[PDB]
UniProtKB/Swiss-Prot annotation:
One of the record's GO cellular component terms: cytosolic small ribosomal subunit
UniProt cross-references to NCBIfam families, sorted A to Z: eS8
Keywords in alphabetical order: Ribonucleoprotein, Ribosomal protein
Pfam families found in the cross-reference section: Ribosomal_S8e
GO MF entries: structural constituent of ribosome
Self-association state and partner proteins as the record states: Part of the 30S ribosomal subunit.
Homology family: Belongs to the eukaryotic ribosomal protein eS8 family.
InterPro entries per UniProt: Ribosomal_eS8 (IPR001047), Ribosomal_eS8_CS (IPR018283), Ribosomal_protein_eS8_arc (IPR020919), Ribosomal_Se8/biogenesis_NSA2 (IPR022309)
Protein name per UniProt: Small ribosomal subunit protein eS8
Gene3D superfamilies on file: 2.40.10.310
GO biological process, one term: maturation of SSU-rRNA from tricistronic rRNA transcript (SSU-rRNA, 5.8S rRNA, LSU-rRNA)
Encoding gene (name): rps8e
Ranges where the record places region Disordered: 1-31
Length: 133
């Protein structure tokens, strides 16, 4: 009870600290080179490509002329039927009936059998031109 000094407060300013200036560290510079290709490699599989398959021989329409003079049966190509059978329109296709005249690379022959599995109709040479009258 008389006199007493009150709470004296001062400003303790001790923030005397500077920062630093920043430079480059170790940043990624140049990128690496690239790969080439495999185009020519695929072109080497492309160059060695195979050829093409060939053709086959087929069954030509034949008449099996037994030649009575030589007594030997032969396969000669069919020209045409001359003496018209009842089944002429079928004999055009080559379905000829026994007794109808036909021309072969041999001569005039008469069909003496039915059409074979080859489409080969057996015939016999009459050893002359049979007069159609």
């Amino acid at each position: 009870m008389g006199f007493y000094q009150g709470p004296d407060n001062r400003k303790i300013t001790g923030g005397l600290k500077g920062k630093h200036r920043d430079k480059r560290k170790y940043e990624i510079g140049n990128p690496p080179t690239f790969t080439t290709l495999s185009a020519e490699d695929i072109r080497i599989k492309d160059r060695t490509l195979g050829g093409n398959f060939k053709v086959r021989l087929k069954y030509t329409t034949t008449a099996n002329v037994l030649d009575p003079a030589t007594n030997t049966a032969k396969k000669v190509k069919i020209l045409e039927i001359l003496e018209t059978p009842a089944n002429k329109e079928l004999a055009r296709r080559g379905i000829i009936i026994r007794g109808a005249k036909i021309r072969t690379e041999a001569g005039l022959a008469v069909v003496t059998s039915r059409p074979g599995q080859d489409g080969v109709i057996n015939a016999v040479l009459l050893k002359n031109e049979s007069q159609r009258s």
